[PDB]
Design a protein around this ligand. Structure first.
Ligand code: HEM
Length: 152
């Protein structure tokens, strides 16, 4: 990414940072409604059925913050994220077993929610820059997954 692309990424991300939990809820609900098989990975809250139930769930709201806190720290490294990716790849490859396809689904949900909430900060410029940043994340985590023996 260019420096200007990174800045577009971080500018919209500052919006997310004003209310991380609410953004996390909207992203995870989007992911689970669009790709329900992904919900199966979350043993604590895989029984949830309705949008209202998902919004009321403390565990889901915690999970959304967990994701976005880690992702935000990754984005802020502007591609220099090997040290932050290392523990994430370790758990997601060997413990949780999250295939790349699911990381594509959550990337799609992130993009969907940013476009829905912050369209003035998410025009084609910013969309394209966030797409690149999330693609780079997936490329690099996929290489780490393979290093660890997981072809997911
Ligand atoms: C942007 C992508 C993601 C980030 C940054 C992220 C980050 C995190 C972090 C920081 C944790 C806690 C520490 C750890 O266990 O590594 C975690 C746990 C977990 N993640 Fe992710 N994650 C991502 C995507 C996904 C997806 C798409 C799924 C499932 C479809 C998933 C499933 C899980 C599960 C099952 C746990 C264990 C939670 C528990 O049972 O307490 N993650 N993730």
């Amino acid at each position: 990414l260019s420096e200007g692309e990174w800045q577009l990424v971080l500018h919209v991300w500052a919006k997310v940072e004003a209310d991380v939990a609410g953004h996390g809820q909207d992203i995870l609900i989007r992911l689970f409604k669009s790709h329900p098989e992904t919900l199966e990975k979350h043993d604590r809250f895989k029984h949830l059925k309705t949008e209202a139930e998902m919004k009321a769930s403390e565990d889901l709201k915690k999970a959304g913050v967990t994701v976005l806190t880690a992702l935000g720290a990754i984005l802020k490294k502007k591609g220099h994220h090997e040290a932050e990716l290392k523990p994430l790849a370790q758990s997601h490859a060997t413990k949780h077993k999250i295939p790349i396809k699911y990381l594509e689904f959550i990337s799609e949900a992130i993009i969907h929610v940013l476009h829905s909430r912050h369209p003035g900060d998410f025009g084609a410029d910013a969309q394209g820059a966030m797409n690149k940043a999330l693609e780079l994340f997936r490329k690099d985590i996929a290489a780490k997954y393979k290093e660890l023996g997981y072809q997911g």
